[PDB]
Ligand binder design. Structure first.
Ligand SMILES: N[C@@H]1[C@@H](O)[C@H](O)[C@@H](CO)O[C@H]1O
Length: 311
């Protein structure tokens, strides 16, 4: 089966202008334009993507990369409210299909993360999934960003998606207490979980990879964001190039090149669909080109090899 590399791209990222011209398209098969936000009434807040979606699509397509619009809650409870209301649900489904057609995208990605009353709300989420699947075009791609092991998705869910992107990161990282938010062991167990418990064929299961981490270091308390999150580019900037080949330095935990490489290796060695990346823009800049994580994924998943013309 064909391997994939699905990269998330935040279209309203502060570093967009500067970094967009550097996207390594040869190492990507799909990109998820980051978030048209779902509103309580089923309508979409497309402010984070409206200004660049068309331009991103033209570029992606020029490099034969598929582009999907990723959807997530506008604010807590809004995505749930939308799917729990019949008319708002039908409106939402029409908006997604319409946005996808209007901007000539290849599909859409569902990133539903309303954890309040998860089990109670799942039947309505399924009703939503079934609907989108029925309303979408046959050729339109339909993917989803999912959690593993800690939340049930049942065994029906899987069949409606071309690719299931496992968010194997942020594990136990929102308290004091430094932790590795994306360990190798958790990555492997998450993959197993979807194949053995959610009964999803390995052929559509894709392992998520983080191009960022967290730091509980006192010296970086202002460099990290809202939740102590820090980009790989930030990690190299403050911790030095030596950080590129480790998953931890002091109280800063992330995924260095060896681990990213090893996760990619596991994917290939066990015939999974491929890998996914949360935020391509978080990667190192060209000042550290050789230490870029996308190049590690590229060397593992999209290695051209030695070839010649006139075969
Ligand atoms: N014709 C091939 C190219 O397609 C390939 O990209 C290049 C890589 O070095 O080798 C050439 O022989």
């Amino acid at each position: 089966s064909l391997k994939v590399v699905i990269g998330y791209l935040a279209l309203d990222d502060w570093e967009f202008e500067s970094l967009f011209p550097t996207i390594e398209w040869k190492y990507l098969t799909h990109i998820n334009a980051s978030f048209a936000r779902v509103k309580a009434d089923g309508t979409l807040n497309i402010n984070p993507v409206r200004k660049r979606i068309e331009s991103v699509r033209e570029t992606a397509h020029k490099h034969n990369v598929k582009i999907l619009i990723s959807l997530a809650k506008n604010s807590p409870g809004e995505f749930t409210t939308a799917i729990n209301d019949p008319k708002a649900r039908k409106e939402l489904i029409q908006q997604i299909i319409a946005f996808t057609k209007e901007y000539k995208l290849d599909g859409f990605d569902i990133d539903y993360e309303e954890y309040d009353n998860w089990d109670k709300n799942f039947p309505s989420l399924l009703v939503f999934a079934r609907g989108l699947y029925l309303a979408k075009e046959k050729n339109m791609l339909m993917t989803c960003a999912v959690n593993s092991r800690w939340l049930n998705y049942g065994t029906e869910w899987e069949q409606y998606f071309d690719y299931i992107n496992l968010m194997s990161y942020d594990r136990g990282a929102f308290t004091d207490k430094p932790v590795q938010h994306a360990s190798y062991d958790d990555f492997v167990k998450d993959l197993k979980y979807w194949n053995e418990q959610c009964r999803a064929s390995k052929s559509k299961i894709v392992g998520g990879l983080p191009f960022y981490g967290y730091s509980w270091e006192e010296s970086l308390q202002g460099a990290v964001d809202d939740v102590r999150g820090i980009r790989y580019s930030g990690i190299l900037k403050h911790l030095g190039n030596e950080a590129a080949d480790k998953d931890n330095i002091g109280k800063t935990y992330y995924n260095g090149r060896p681990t990213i490489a090893n996760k990619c290796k596991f994917i290939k060695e066990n015939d999974y669909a491929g890998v996914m990346i949360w935020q391509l823009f978080q990667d190192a800049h060209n000042d550290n080109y050789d230490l870029k994580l996308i190049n590690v994924v590229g060397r593992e998943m999209m290695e051209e090899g030695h070839h010649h013309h006139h075969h």
